[PDB]
Write a protein that binds this ligand. Sequence first.
Ligand SMILES: CCCCCCCCCCCCO[C@@H]1O[C@H](CO)[C@@H](O[C@H]2O[C@H](CO)[C@@H](O)[C@H](O)[C@H]2O)[C@H](O)[C@H]1O
Ligand SMILES: COCCOCCOCCOc1ccc(C(C)(C)CC(C)(C)C)cc1
Lengths: 89, 66, 186, 162, 96, 274, 103, 100, 114, 69, 103
Amino acid sequence: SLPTFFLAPPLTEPFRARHRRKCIEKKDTFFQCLDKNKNETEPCEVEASGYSQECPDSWRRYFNEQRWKALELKGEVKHANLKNTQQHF
Amino acid sequence: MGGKASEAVTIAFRFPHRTTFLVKQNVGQKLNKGHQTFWQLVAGGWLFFLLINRTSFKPKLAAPKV
Amino acid sequence: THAELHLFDLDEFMQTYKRLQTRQDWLIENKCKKSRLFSYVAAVIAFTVGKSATMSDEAILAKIDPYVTSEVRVQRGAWWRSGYFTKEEVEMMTPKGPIARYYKFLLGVRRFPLKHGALSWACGFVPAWLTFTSLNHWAQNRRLNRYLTQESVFGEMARELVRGKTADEATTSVMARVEKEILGVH
Amino acid sequence: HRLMLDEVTESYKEIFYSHYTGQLRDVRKCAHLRLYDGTSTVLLLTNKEPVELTSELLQKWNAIKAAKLSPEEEKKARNEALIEAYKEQELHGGPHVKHMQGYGIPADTPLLGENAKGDQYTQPPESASIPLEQLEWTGDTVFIPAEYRTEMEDWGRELTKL
Amino acid sequence: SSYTGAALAPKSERLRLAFEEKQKDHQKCIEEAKGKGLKKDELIDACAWTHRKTILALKDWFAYRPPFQDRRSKWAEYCSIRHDSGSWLGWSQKFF
Amino acid sequence: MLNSNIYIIIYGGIIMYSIMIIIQMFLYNFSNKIYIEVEINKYILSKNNIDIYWIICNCTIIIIITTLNHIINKIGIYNMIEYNICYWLIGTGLGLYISPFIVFGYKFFVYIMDLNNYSLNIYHNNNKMNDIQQIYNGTNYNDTMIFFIKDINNIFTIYRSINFFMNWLYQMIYYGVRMWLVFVLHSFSLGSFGELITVITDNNLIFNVFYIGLLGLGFILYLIVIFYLGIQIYVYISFSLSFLHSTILLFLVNYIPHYNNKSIFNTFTNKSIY
Amino acid sequence: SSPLVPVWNDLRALQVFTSQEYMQKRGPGFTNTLEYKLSCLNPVKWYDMMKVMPGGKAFVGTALGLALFGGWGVEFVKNISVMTKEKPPIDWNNEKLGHLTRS
Amino acid sequence: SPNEHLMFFDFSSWLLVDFGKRWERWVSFKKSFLTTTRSPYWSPQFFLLTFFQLRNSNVKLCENWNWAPKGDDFNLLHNSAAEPFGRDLKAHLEREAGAK
Amino acid sequence: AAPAEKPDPALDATKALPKALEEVEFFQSYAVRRKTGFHLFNRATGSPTIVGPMFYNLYNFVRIGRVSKYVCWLSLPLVFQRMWMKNRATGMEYDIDLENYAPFEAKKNPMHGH
Amino acid sequence: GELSEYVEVNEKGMPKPQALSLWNMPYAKRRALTKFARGVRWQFIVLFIALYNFKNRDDSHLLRRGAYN
Amino acid sequence: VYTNWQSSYTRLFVSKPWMWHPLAWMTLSVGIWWKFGKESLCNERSFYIHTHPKWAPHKFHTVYNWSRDPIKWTLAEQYASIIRNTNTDIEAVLKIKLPANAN
Ligand SMILES: CCCCCCCCCCCCO[C@@H]1O[C@H](CO)[C@@H](O[C@H]2O[C@H](CO)[C@@H](O)[C@H](O)[C@H]2O)[C@H](O)[C@H]1O
Ligand SMILES: COCCOCCOCCOc1ccc(C(C)(C)CC(C)(C)C)cc1
């Protein structure tokens, strides 16, 4: 309890920050290529694999929701599918 | 699942020592006891601790001032 | 001896309508918790100090002398053999806590010894019992006084109960206000 | 058949079943109930070792107490009787307490591993340095009733109350 | 597909929406009883079920207090552990 | 209303069916008393024997009574009661589980709370450093910087004290479940075979006759049922007690040899010296 | 039980008797060191040496350790399978609901 | 049927107990007992009848859980959401086109 | 530890099987029957049956009962009740519409739940 | 036999080997091995599991709030 | 001659742990139901599990009749009796608009 919550976190900070940075990079590259190829997942399969490998599911869901919202904004769609998504605020 | 008594020591292995009553000659060690006014001050401190931590129930705060 | 009877119904109301609890009510409850927890330590201290006023030197040496604090682990023969344990070795085996030091000082203090039994124990339990009960009682009194001056739903309920009203009537009187001001009734 | 003794049997009967016969009882037949117990001993603690008290040592101590001698002579005679009794019990095979279940005197402490100096596997106590002629009574005593069946601890929640 | 993960809406919003759904299910019973031409005493026997369901949803909403923000709760959030910042003893606070 | 928290309990035939289980105990009059006497005196020797003995006797006879009421007096609960898992876990197993803790709870509690002060047990512990380690540091082991994890250590040590009382619980649950499965599955299988036979014979009325006999088949099935269920109850009781021995009662082995007394008519006292 | 029990017993005996060997080797003078003088003022040492005392002090020590830290230990064990799990944002109280003027 | 023999349908009724009302009446009886007897706070009566209730209420009111229990706020089964790329987006656009 | 207890004969097992065989012999003693009025249909081979020659014992014990021998037969008419009702049901004519709308204990009926 | 937390002793005060002998190595090696050992085995395992799950704890609930932006 | 067997049941109970055993059994069974079986089975919010064919097969001697719903109408009659004894307004609950813990 005490080591896990008062000595572990400064030691696990950088190992996690690097993972976060890598996930953000892979997310940005993947969604950039999706913006290029008109939301097609056939050419950018390597970046899709990197996105699924590095970023975890709980992060992938938030990024998918954010991209749905972005596509609503730029007019690509209307009334994006938010059936099973966190409706927090 | 779980252990057994056959796989452990007894209640006689632990707690094996029977009783032996020690006695000591009186040289005068329990004589000339000082601090005769100790318990008076202890009781005073106890009552003081109880008084500072006292709180009377004041229901008049619930009076219909409005 | 009268605040707990109202605090029962007030606590039932709070448990039901806990959504209507503010931060200051939470802090009041936390303060009552703090007083309750310190009351245990105060009771233990009072028990020790009271029972020590009726303990003979043998009853204290039972708690200081490592001959008696070692009866679980060590043979009694190790203490009968002179030189088995050295002086420094016997010294490290003695208890060092504040109760042991209090008793060590209390050897040379005059007191009123009694035979080891129920009276020597009651002379600690009675002060400890009174300390615990009175501290918790005054804590509940402080809790009610703090609730009454609190401009909240629970303060209103506590006030309505202190007037001398029934639990059901006070719940209805306060919920009539909750529906209008808080919830915004249709 | 596992707990009672066959020698305290008639005394047990006379003490507990004499309301059947109507005969009086002899108290010595109740003292025979102590045969269920072990031998009650008294270890006097000295600066060297504990010594078991005996009728002879107690008689000598009572005699010295009755003579009303100076303490320089009183302590000398007491320690003489004490060393005599020490030698006597060392010849007997040690005190009775060394070979009684639940009690015991530890032997010399062992030397562990590299601390063992060849054949000397033990580390005697400090008092081994003291010569035996300086044997003095510490004024401390240890009563050992050896009540294996009579002790009030094993009585129970009910027998004590009654 | 499916996944085991976090609840979508918060507890407060979940209880609020549940109460609204039971409100609707009770309003429908009441409107139907009115269409059938039932009085108050008959309307009670009709829609007491939905009334109790609404009342239970309301009880659930009132019983749950959303948590207050403080240093311990924030540290537990960083640690991502379920933590009560109103307990000095934890599971033993139940007995003390 | 909000404050009304409603509970639905379920209730059936309990009173008159439980009364006769106890009224039958005067007829049986503890016929199992000798068997449990023999076994308890095999497994333990103490002053508190009779206590545990009585417990087991009561438990056992109740089981026996229910079994016969389950076999013969077929009404209402007496049929289900042996087919229910709650009866086998709480109505037979829990009492046998808590019996030694209710008879020897003092010693077991003291033992358990001493084992939280975990230490290595040495035979012929004539060592001196062992004592200093046990008193100063608390244990033989190195306890340096274990307080750093005390929050877990405490609870883990608690299990470390009761781990050698846990297989008793496991065996109780296991044999309760075993008896439940045995009764249920054997009744179901027997009834299923019977129903298949009735289907074969109802469609062929040349065979829809008392082909074995009115009493022959019934007498044979009676003997089979009683023999099997008596064997199972004997297994349950005997194994429960053997596991009680091997799991809970070997802790209480304290053999004291008889030491002869010599100073009967005279006792040394504080006044003999002082 | 497992057949590795004598292995664990050998290792336990190893650590125990090696600590005892060290205590014999260093000999007297432990009371003059700073470690002893600090442990005399250390509540961990008070608790640990009070645990083994007689008079129910084992029960007192166990129950005290439970009431103080064992509850947090139970919570810690419960939280091992919670750290890895996706949890939603904490719906922090807006501290707006509950206020009501007195009358 | 054999399963019919493994059934207990000897039930009689459903006992309905409003534990809230029963708890309220119990608390009222405790208050009445403590008032009629004019018992002080240091009494074992007052202690037994007040302290545990007050303690449990204070514990249940002081609790500030950052998250609700396991199977109430997380660890819940949820159907996978539609992604904003690939086949799901194409199906969404096709639905929008067909509907309109 | 080394109590040296002599063997207790009461802990032996040398009476249970004799006692059970004594009970079985008492049972079989009531199977003794006179030659007059004796008849037992043997198998087609000519060898005896199993249940056949052990009916006289059972009914000689039924003779000694007091209540069961006059009560336990009252559940037997129920057997013939089933024998008759089963044959009544084997060919009972029923409405097709009710059987298709309300089939008894048929699977996949949503009104039942499955 | 082979009880738990139990060990016999010979005339020299030394532990008798139940399965394996480790008293041939010098005192220095034993002190090196046992200076960091304790009377606790499974708690360290549970602690390493907890540290692994803490290193691999989830922070989505912080991402939703914007603490990583 | 005095005996607690014939003159005091209390001292007889106190002097015999095999008389404490059934009482502890009873208390433990009731505690088990209180902790585990009470809220999961007997509460109104948890009483429809008795309609489950897997966890409560043939609790009504048949599969549960959902078209009939005896539980619903029984409990509805009882709630209606509660409402009539309390004189609560049925439609007062529908006039409520709960807020949200914003932010
Ligand atoms: C004959 C067999 C049955 C015997 C049953 C006897 C059981 C006796 C133990 C009673 C236990 C008291 O336990 C107490 O239960 C009540 C409900 O009753 C809980 O009460 C809780 O729920 C009730 C309603 O459900 C709320 O109104 C109340 O505000 C809340 O605190 C208490 O928090 C708990 O402290
Ligand atoms: C309580 O224990 C008593 C149970 O005993 C039941 C014994 O059941 C078997 C009796 O059945 C038989 C078997 C054979 C026979 C007779 C056929 C012995 C053989 C004979 C008459 C041809 C010699 C009679 C009855």
